[model samples]
Target: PLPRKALLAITSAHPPFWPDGKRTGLFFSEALHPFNELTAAGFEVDVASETGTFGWDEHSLTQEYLSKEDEKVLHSEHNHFMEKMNKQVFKAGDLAPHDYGLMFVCGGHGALYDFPHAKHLQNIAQDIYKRGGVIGAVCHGPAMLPGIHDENGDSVIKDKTVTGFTTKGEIMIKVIDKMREDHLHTIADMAQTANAEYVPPEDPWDDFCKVDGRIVTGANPQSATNTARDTIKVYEGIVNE
Candidate 1:
């Protein structure tokens, strides 16, 4: 039988950077909102992290930034998935590419810190794309792509026009104390260094989506809505050439 549902992969938040571990794992509403939207649209979603656990950030859930209608949606279907997802969370290496129609990398403060450096995530992206599947990412999520090199030692995003949190936005949010200064490094730095085309998001959490083949990206939280919107379109074969 054809795959009954699309599988989406998300990384866990991890801390000191994910609000300093105070906000590690997936950033609550970041992945949940999109997950709910995708599943409601008839896709099955699966959660994955660097290691795989319920290691999501603390702020996103507590703040409950989503609207009443959106919140209700999250709790109804997404929460159930979260429950099941936490129970059988898979590591990146264990993931099977053919099972999922789409792959999403969720971002958090921690992602900026850990994602760019994760070799496993780099492997997953290459493996999935090589399998003819779609891939998507948001904010720090895009950071996961730049460092991946196939057998030829070329970046998955070597020549892609991609956008991420942007060095400007990172400094503006000042999520980390020294982020404004040169005291720290982030996914944006890596993306730039990786030679991907970088653009700044107009504002935090703004709606900006960029597409390159099977790859899709959203600048930051502002791009979340559009990012998820684009992700669904890709999985359903509506977008892309």
Candidate 2:
């Protein structure tokens, strides 16, 4: 039986990648939205980072994204997500992967910089997956999936259908060149590199999610909640089977 728990992998990298070079880190709601949905679905969720540290993505702090209620939760120590984040986010490798039924790699432009090629982080994702757990990634979160593999050393997402923050959306948000500044690949580019089918969303901002077996990928930030929910659905489907 699969464990009814989830781990939200936060991005610890903050980069001056935004237009005008604003610093960006965790796309706050990408994890918060999923944390909310996952917890409501009766799954225990843990939030952590590769380095046990994180900085806020300035863009995510804008009123365009965060509401009064959301802001309050962000700062509240009582919020489970905020509490773990502030008290000391344990390192990804420090966690026991089998304790989780799901591992959700959250997004921000920051993810493109740090999530890839992070061995410890990839190990957790790989272990949870190979052990029959679901792996959820949203928006730029799919950046973490490119290098993850199974115990057999094969790419976990290879040959699977996936979606992520689109290249066009990155261009619309003015971050594609910033991504190349570090020689990073777009979600589609990485998916192609990994031999996964890339599916573009009808509208990049639409709440879209694609679940291919235990691998679930989302289109953009707007799809965070739906992605989490669908991950739960897929997890349940596996458990029922």
Candidate 3:
């Protein structure tokens, strides 16, 4: 039977550079684009973060980052999903792996601080993978991948081809210093460190999605929608089999 549910892992961490600024959290496009795609495809998604509280990257809520439909959802009184995400979210450590057929980690710069070593989220990913479900991530979302392991307890991305936001983009954005200060590796480095082939888009901002078996990844915020679509497609293939 097709699993109608998925777990959306969000970051609860804030950006290192924003000490007194607005909290840094999930990127609006990265999470909302995929959320819209999944729900439209009949998947019920549960939001989870390392901490129970939802963190917001206020910068991501701008008109530039939000679509018309996304704006509508944010403003509608019936926007339960948005509301749920704004409130206390499920803790990653408390997630029930059986309830979800797939997992997607949403990305923001904040994810660089939180997702990589999140053991609880890694456990959920490992569980989903071991159970033959799909695993997906976009941009910094791939930060979580190196920590997830296969049944053999090896990095799940080992020897697999994957794509994520490029180091060049990080340099273009001028966050390399902050990232370096935090001792966080670039998404490409994270994948390569795990022995996974790191494939990059021709342009840092282009829309690109790559699927290596059940593992699906998007290059950047522009690729979230396609990433979600391919993820659902991969999930459907597994459940249908």
Candidate 4:
């Protein structure tokens, strides 16, 4: 059985892709939601980035995204999650991959910039999966999936069904052109690594999640909590098996 610990991966990249130059960085709730769910389920979760640093995506701090209580905790250093995200943010390479039962990537436009080529972070994910641990992501978090592989050197998502930020949402947000211009890979494109198929949600912003064996994925920030819950389900089943 895998350890009862998880690595909640966040982005170390921040890009000024938002209209008017409001930098797009970590989408707080994407990680925060999973952090809350996994921690409540009795798992020790380390919130980290490749460089042990992160910045907030401006849009994620809006009233539309975070609840009043969530906003409060976002600014509070005393909150455990915030503390882990802030002063305690760990370097991705500091921990051993085998120490984790799961590795979950948090979503943001910034993930499109860093998650794919993050060598050390991808190495940890690869080791965890090859060792029978779970992996999960939500929204653009799946950007990391293409870089992870199975024991035979095939992409871990190869032949696996998953879900992530929909193309429709990217288009609706008007970030499609920017992504294209930057040659940034979207979830749809990333899933095609080794011909993996991506399942889209009925509504672009609706909560959607999928479990393909030990890999769990979700579409958009709205799906983060459900994705984490499904990850727990998959992990529990693995432990019981």
Over the stretch 62-98, how does candidate 1's per-residue lDDT look in tens digits? 5345566545644674457556565767776677656
Deviation of model 1 at 200, angstroms: 1.4
lDDT of 3 by residue, 47-166 (tens): 998876656667677787788887787777657667767663799898788788899889888888888888888898888888888899998899999999987877989999999989
Error of 2 at 159 (Å): 1.1
Rank candidates by TM-score, best first.
4, 2, 3, 1
Q: What is model 3's C-alpha RMSD?
A: 1.9
Q: Lowest-scoring 10 consecutive residues by lDDT in candidate 1?
A: 1-10
The per-prediction tally of clashing pairs is 15, 0, 0, 0
Global Cα lDDT for candidate 2? 0.86
- Which model is ahead, 1 or 4, in terms of TM-score? 4
Prediction 4 global C-alpha lDDT: 0.89
lDDT of 2 by residue, 35-126 (tens): 89998999887787888888988989888888787899877878777876688577888898778888888998888888887778888888
Better-scoring candidate (lDDT), 1 or 3 = 3
TM-scores, in order shown? 0.81, 0.95, 0.93, 0.97
Give the best candidate by lDDT.
4
Error of 1 at 80 (Å): 2.3
